[PDB]
Amino acid sequence: FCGSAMATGKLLISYSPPGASVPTSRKDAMLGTHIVWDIGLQSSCVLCVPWISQSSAGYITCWYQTNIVVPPGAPTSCDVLCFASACNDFSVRLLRDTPFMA
Amino acid sequence: VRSMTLGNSTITTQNVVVGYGEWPSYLSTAEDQPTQPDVATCRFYTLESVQWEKTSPGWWWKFPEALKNMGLFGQNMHYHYLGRAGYTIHVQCNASKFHQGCLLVVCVPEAEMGCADTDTTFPATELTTEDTPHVFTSDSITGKKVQAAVCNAGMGVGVGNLTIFPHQWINLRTNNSATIVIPYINSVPMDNMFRHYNFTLMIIPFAPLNFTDGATAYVPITVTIAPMYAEYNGLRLA
Amino acid sequence: VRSMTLGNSTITTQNVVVGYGEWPSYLSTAEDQPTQPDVATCRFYTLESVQWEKTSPGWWWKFPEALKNMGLFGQNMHYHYLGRAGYTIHVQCNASKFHQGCLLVVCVPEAEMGCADTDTTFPATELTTEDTPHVFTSDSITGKKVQAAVCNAGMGVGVGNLTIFPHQWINLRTNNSATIVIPYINSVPMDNMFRHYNFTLMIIPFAPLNFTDGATAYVPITVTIAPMYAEYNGLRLA
Amino acid sequence: VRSMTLGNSTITTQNVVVGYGEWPSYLSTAEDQPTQPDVATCRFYTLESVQWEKTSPGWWWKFPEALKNMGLFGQNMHYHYLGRAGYTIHVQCNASKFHQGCLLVVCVPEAEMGCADTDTTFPATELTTEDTPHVFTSDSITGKKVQAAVCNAGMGVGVGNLTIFPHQWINLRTNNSATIVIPYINSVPMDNMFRHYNFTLMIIPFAPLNFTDGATAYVPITVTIAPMYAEYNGLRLA
Amino acid sequence: QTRHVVNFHSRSESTIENFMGRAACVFMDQYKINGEETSTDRFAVWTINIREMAQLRRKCEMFTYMRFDIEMTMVITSCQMPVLTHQIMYVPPGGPIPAKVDGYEWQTSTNPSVFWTEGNAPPRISIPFISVGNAYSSFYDGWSHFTQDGTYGYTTLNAMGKLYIRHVNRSSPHQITSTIRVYFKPKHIKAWVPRPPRLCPYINKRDVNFVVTEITDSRTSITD
């Protein structure tokens, strides 16, 4: 969370399994897998998404649990950066040519 | 900062008021045998966040049936007609440093509320709207509904001395979070979860919210309930 | 007479053919973690009884998805997209003492069946009608459906030497019950339960039913499946 | 708060990202003998502070020759034609508590940058202006100079996955200071300090600066470099 | 296709030697046998560098520094006689080059060359780590000539040599047009200092110049 040091709110980060459908509402995301990430306490919440392979995948949605509460001095609109890597160890087998290069 | 987790629900927290000095527990017969779900049920059910403005008089939720549409706990209410639970209730406020105010977070077992115009009753959809809270009012009201004026919260008592119950103050000067554990107060070991409202979580702002013309015009209050030690009747033969 | 019980389902039974000499077992990684339901799932799912007349050519069921509407096992198929199970299959016949006949109760893993008029395919609702069985036919048939003529059961093989699979004869002279345990034969440890039919329970009358003009004109065949050691993928984070 | 001092230069600091897990060290021959200055050279060379507004796209410095006019280190570059060093780089931001933003402080060894209009080169004064930084641009540019558009920082790579190098995030919510130690990455033990730019300290604002109408319209970023374990060739006979 | 349980645990195919050490065709060229006694179309050149084709070039730019033996095997054809014999002369970085098919450089004892006659197995010639430094540099943020002169980005440390190829047959009755395919392969490869992958397409084979490309493919909204 790259907002102010005075901005405070909650975000609800839901994960859908690879077969399941996306939550259409915040309540339906709360009934599945989620983490109510309090911004005012910690500013960096870490996941670890399993069952990621190919040879119809999951979803990382994010919801307003609460709005961003801000004092009169700090700005109202903030940003959230995301990151991604291999969680513990990663398995990979069959080398090929990349599609990007032409 | 402690990141509690239960099942597939993790919240982020920042002292617990154990209601009546007791921690919820199981009931411990072959004539009547309880079923202990344990699986799921115990996860955190975060309700919808409630915006607290300068003119908000209060709110109340009536449990156990406030969770009647909340997942497996709200689905085991329809298959078993007897049950009991513990309901750890976290109440955050995540206001700023320039906001001021104070809340009474109290649980009030057996809150029998009174109708607005006496000599009649209310249509039973005025006590509870499952997930969403019924607000109080600042003055007296009429009509076939609950007399929801503060200073006489629901029961005809003074609202100031509502502190006799399991309570917690949320003074935005000092703290923001409250947590209450309510070990199933009832006169029968198991009761139906749709007829009987075991307790009434009501959040009442004593000192009103105040701020200046730059802050956000509200403070969202977040309510989270974890049904602990929920056990039900048996469905199998003996 | 042994009265087996599993969960909340008790049947009454009267030797087990363990398929390929192996008893089903669990798969035993943090990159992929299975969930073992154990609770429910293992109970007995009795299908609808099937009347066996003098002119019945046979039946087949395609599992795992024959149980797609059977309780929690048929509901965990919709929430998890990977799974495996064992399927203890009891087949009673409860005929009389004056009825005669013989059945082949065989399981046939990976029964890829052929269309009735080749050069085309069938509309996918011809292989399975969940609970109810597709019957075979006594002669050849046409149309966009399964070539269900016996002597070429589904796969273009001889129906007599279908005994290579886990089988059991039900000779009404001697016995009436069959039981087969099929320890999840597949080339991948877990697979989707709606795309892939792991095996095909087909019951084929070799010697036809016969009786005189006083007996009941049929013999009801009762099929009971207990999904053993069912495990699924994980839905929680790591 | 730790008040580090080196020679006659003291700074005031508030965790170190040791680049590639190695601390700079000396090279340990009579055919070629290095000279270790130790005296001076190791002191802190604070560059000019850089104002970070809401519309700043980024900056870059090219070392070792960014210090080409900095004291004895910038004077030993003219007398010795071979050298190596370590360059502890402190990056403070000293913003307020109501400012918000985020920086990527990355070092990028061997940042070969691309010309703005390809089919030609740039006049060599576009990569570096000794002490002062070349800014990036928000969009594409033309002319005989460096293609300094962010999202393609200098090298034609994605600017988001520039985190593979020795980096440090400066999130004004949490921290303000960064420190990186870069242990002389090169394919030859000693190289000329005017031809070859060993690494490129580039500071890139991912989340832009934001504030309200009362704060200061900028945040000064302070860069401080301490050349560690600098050693040169020998000038004496053998 | 369908999403299967891809269950295994292996990273032996992700090591550097199992990622870079793969033979790829890097040089097709024609060269005649007769006519035009002073011509440049009777032999091949191919200055050896990793920046030949963009598919391999992209893999060498994962890493800043790398050192490796190279083991190339030519595949020589012919069109249109006797049995033909070829010559694949590798000159080192310090080595004289021919100007014509009949130059005296072809007879230099310090330029190793294979004499492959047609019909046999393909000729294989292996070259060790030649460079003066301690590794080949994929990128060189520096100037060849001191005091910021011309030729940006080109160091002389990552020079690998050249590969002059000709027929040894002096003449022929008719025209024979031979085609050679050089199969480059890194061997015993080490690599230092990882580096983010190339995003933009390549422009030229001696520079890093590029057109500003978008980061990823765009989608409609942030939530779809």
Tell me the two tokens of residue B173: 């000067």
Q: E5 and C82 in contact by Cβ < 8 A? A: yes
Report the distance separating Cα B84 and Cα B104, nearest Å. Answer: 25
Nearest partner of A61 among A10, A8, A23, A21, judged by Cα: A23
Report the distance separating Cα D209 and Cα E125, nearest Å. Answer: 58
Kindly list the residues from chain A whose CB atom is less than 8 angstroms away from the CB atom of residue E11. 89-92
PDB resolution in Å: 3.7
Report the distance separating Cα C153 and Cα C136, nearest Å. Answer: 7
Question: CB within 8 A of E55, min separation 6: which ones?
Answer: A97, A98, A101, E24
Task: Report the binding-site residues of B for guanine.
Answer: 23
User: What Rg do the C-alpha atoms of chain E give, in angstroms?
Assistant: 22
Q: Is A19 exposed, middle or buried (0-12, 13-18, 19+ CB in 10 A)?
A: buried
CB A14 within 8 A of CB A25: no
CA separation, residue C116 to residues B182, C110, C129, C139, C146 (Å): 67, 19, 18, 11, 5
Report the distance separating Cα D60 and Cα D169, nearest Å. Answer: 16
Report the distance separating Cα B117 and Cα A64, nearest Å. Answer: 39
**Chain E nearest C-alpha distance from C96 (Å):** 48
Tell me the two tokens of residue B225: 């309930």
What are residue D77's phi and psi, to 5 degrees?
-70, -30
**Chain E nearest C-alpha distance from C30 (Å):** 12
Beta bridge partners, B63, equal: B199
CB C17 within 8 A of CB C90: no
Beta bridge partners, A14, equal: A34, A61
A 10 A CB-CB count for B186 gives 13
CB C17 within 8 A of CB C166: yes
Report the distance separating Cα E149 and Cα E143, nearest Å. Answer: 7
Rama region for D31: left / alpha / beta (φ>0; ψ in -120 to 50; rest): alpha
CB D136 within 8 A of CB D108: no
**Chain E nearest C-alpha distance from D149 (Å):** 7
DSSP for residue E91: E
A 10 A CB-CB count for E161 gives 18
Question: CB within 8 A of D176, min separation 6: which ones?
Answer: D14, D92, D93, D94, D95, D170
Report the distance separating Cα E59 and Cα E16, nearest Å. Answer: 10
CB B38 within 8 A of CB B208: no
Domains and CATH numbers, chain C: 1-238 (2.60.120.20)
SS3 for E183? strand
Q: D124 and E149 in contact by Cβ < 8 A? A: yes
Report the distance separating Cα D113 and Cα D155, nearest Å. Answer: 5
Report the distance separating Cα C210 and Cα E56, nearest Å. Answer: 77
Is the peptide bond prior to B64 cis by the omega test (within 30 degrees of 0)? yes
Report the distance separating Cα C71 and Cα E111, nearest Å. Answer: 81
Residue D206 contacts A where some CB pair is shorter than 8 Å? yes
Q: Do chains E and D touch (3 or more CB pairs under 8 A)?
A: yes
DSSP for residue E186: E
Report the distance separating Cα B202 and Cα B59, nearest Å. Answer: 6
Kindly list the residues from chain A whose CB atom is less than 8 angstroms away from the CB atom of residue E1. 55
Report the distance separating Cα D230 and Cα E14, nearest Å. Answer: 37
What are residue E109's phi and psi, to 5 degrees?
-70, -20
Nearest partner of A33 among B8, B37, C8, judged by Cα: B8
Q: A19 and C30 in contact by Cβ < 8 A? A: no
Nearest partner of B191 among B131, B234, B232, judged by Cα: B232
DSSP for residue E31: E
Residue C236 contacts B where some CB pair is shorter than 8 Å? yes
CB D4 within 8 A of CB D11: yes
Tell me the two tokens of residue B51: 């915006």
Beta strands in chain A (DSSP E): 10-16, 33-38, 59-64
CB C93 within 8 A of CB C100: no
A 10 A CB-CB count for C125 gives 8
Report the distance separating Cα E68 and Cα B235, nearest Å. Answer: 72
User: What Rg do the C-alpha atoms of chain D give, in angstroms?
Assistant: 18
CB E84 within 8 A of CB E169: yes
CA separation, residue C182 to residues C63, C171, C229, D45, E102 (Å): 11, 22, 11, 76, 79
Report the distance separating Cα D173 and Cα E23, nearest Å. Answer: 51
What are residue B203's phi and psi, to 5 degrees?
-110, 120
- One-letter amino acid at D182 equals I
Breaks in chain C (C to N > 2.5 A) come right after 14, 28
What are residue E84's phi and psi, to 5 degrees?
-90, 145
**Residue E55 parent element (H or E):** helix E54-60
At CA E182, angle to CA E179 and CA E188, rounded to 5? 170
Report the distance separating Cα B64 and Cα B197, nearest Å. Answer: 6
Tell me the two tokens of residue E194: 């990882």
Question: CB within 8 A of E58, min separation 6: which ones?
Answer: A98, A101, E197, E198
Beta bridge partners, D226, equal: D88
Kindly list the residues from chain A whose CB atom is less than 8 angstroms away from the CB atom of residue B44. 36
Beta bridge partners, E66, equal: E136, E191
- One-letter amino acid at B126 equals E
Is the peptide bond prior to C64 cis by the omega test (within 30 degrees of 0)? yes
Nearest partner of A14 among A27, A33, A1, judged by Cα: A33
Q: E6 and A54 in contact by Cβ < 8 A? A: yes
Kindly list the residues from chain A whose CB atom is less than 8 angstroms away from the CB atom of residue E55. 97-98, 101
What are residue A15's phi and psi, to 5 degrees?
-125, 125
**Residue D78 parent element (H or E):** helix D71-79
Report the distance separating Cα B11 and Cα B25, nearest Å. Answer: 23
Elucidation method: cryo-EM
Question: CB within 8 A of D103, min separation 6: which ones?
Answer: D52, D91, D93, D169, D170, D178, D203, D204, D205, D206, D221
Report the distance separating Cα D35 and Cα D235, nearest Å. Answer: 8
A 10 A CB-CB count for B205 gives 23
Report the distance separating Cα C149 and Cα C58, nearest Å. Answer: 9
A 10 A CB-CB count for D95 gives 22
CB C233 within 8 A of CB A17: yes
Task: Report the binding-site residues of C.
Answer: 23
Report the distance separating Cα D222 and Cα D209, nearest Å. Answer: 16
At CA D10, angle to CA D5 and CA D14, rounded to 5? 85
Determine the distance from the C-alpha atom of residue E129 to the mean position of all C-alpha atoms in its chain, rounded to a whole number.
14
Rama region for B40: left / alpha / beta (φ>0; ψ in -120 to 50; rest): left
Residue E145 contacts C where some CB pair is shorter than 8 Å? no
SS3 for E14? helix
A 10 A CB-CB count for E191 gives 23
Instruction: Calculate the CA dihedral of residues B143, B148, B151, B153 and round it to 10 degrees.
Output: 130
Q: B92 and A30 in contact by Cβ < 8 A? A: no
Tell me the two tokens of residue D136: 């990036």
Q: Which of A2, A5, A73 sits opposite D207 (nearest CB)?
A: A2
Kindly list the residues from chain A whose CB atom is less than 8 angstroms away from the CB atom of residue D100. 2-5, 7, 74-75, 78
Kindly list the residues from chain E whose CB atom is less than 8 angstroms away from the CB atom of residue A102. 54, 201
Q: E7 and C82 in contact by Cβ < 8 A? A: no
Nearest partner of E4 among D58, A55, B162, judged by Cα: A55
Q: Judging by DSSP bridges, how do beta strands E63-77 and E124-127 pair with one another? A: antiparallel
CB proximity under 8 Å: C 118-137 to E: none
SS3 for E58? helix
Q: Token match 């966040």: residue? A: B49
Report the distance separating Cα B232 and Cα C17, nearest Å. Answer: 40
Q: A49 and C237 in contact by Cβ < 8 A? A: yes
CB E51 within 8 A of CB E182: no
Domains and CATH numbers, chain E: 1-224 (2.60.120.20)
**Chain A nearest C-alpha distance from D131 (Å):** 30
Q: Token match 């309090």: residue? A: A38
DSSP for residue D115: B
Q: Do chains B and E touch (3 or more CB pairs under 8 A)?
A: no
Q: C237 and B8 in contact by Cβ < 8 A? A: yes
Query: Does D61 appear as a known binding residue?
Result: no
What are residue D47's phi and psi, to 5 degrees?
-80, 175
Length of chain E: 224
A 10 A CB-CB count for D11 gives 16
Q: How many CB pairs under 8 A join D and E?
A: 114
> If DSSP states are collapsed to H, E and C, what string results for chain C?
CECCEECCEECCECCCEEHHHCCCCCCCCCCCCCECCCCCCCCCEECCCEEECCCCCCEEEEECHHHCCCHHHHHHHHHCCCEECCCEEEEECCCCCCCECEEEEECCECCCCCECCCCCCCCCCCCCECCECEECECCCCCCCCECCECCCCCCCCCCCCCCCCCEEEEECCCCCCEEEECCCCCCCCCECCCCCCCEEEEEEECCCCECCCCCCCCEEEEEEEECCCCEECCCCCC
Q: Is C193 exposed, middle or buried (0-12, 13-18, 19+ CB in 10 A)?
A: buried
CB C89 within 8 A of CB C61: no
Report the distance separating Cα D206 and Cα E214, nearest Å. Answer: 16
A 10 A CB-CB count for C153 gives 25
Beta bridge partners, E163, equal: E90
Q: A36 and B11 in contact by Cβ < 8 A? A: yes
Q: In a mutagenesis test of the C interface, which of A13, A47, A51, A85 is the best target, namely the one with the most C β-carbons within 10 Å?
A: A51
CA separation, residue D169 to residues A74, D104, D113, D160, E163 (Å): 21, 5, 23, 12, 48
> If DSSP states are collapsed to H, E and C, what string results for chain B?
CECCEECCEEECECCCEEHHHCCCCCCCCCCCCCECCCCCCCCCEECCCEEECCCCCCEEEEECHHHCCCHHHHHHHHHCCCEECCCEEEEECCCCCCCECEEEEECCECCCCCECCCCCCCCCCCCCECCECEECECCCCCCCCECCECCCCCCCCCCCCCCCCCEEEEECCCCCCEEEECCCCCCCCCECCCCCCCEEEEEEECCCCECCCCCCCCEEEEEEEECCCCEECCCCCC
Length of chain A: 102
Question: CB within 8 A of E33, min separation 6: which ones?
Answer: E42, E84, E167, E169, E171, E172, E175, E176, E177, E178
Report the distance separating Cα D183 and Cα D193, nearest Å. Answer: 15
**Residue A53 parent element (H or E):** none
CA separation, residue D208 to residues C14, D64, D129, D179, D181 (Å): 77, 29, 25, 21, 26
Task: Report the binding-site residues of C for guanine.
Answer: 23
**Could you tell me which chain E residue has the CA closest to the CA of C27?**
E7
Q: Which of A15, A47, A51 sits opposite C233 (nearest CB)?
A: A51
Kindly list the residues from chain A whose CB atom is less than 8 angstroms away from the CB atom of residue E58. 98, 101
Kindly list the residues from chain A whose CB atom is less than 8 angstroms away from the CB atom of residue C79. 17, 19-20
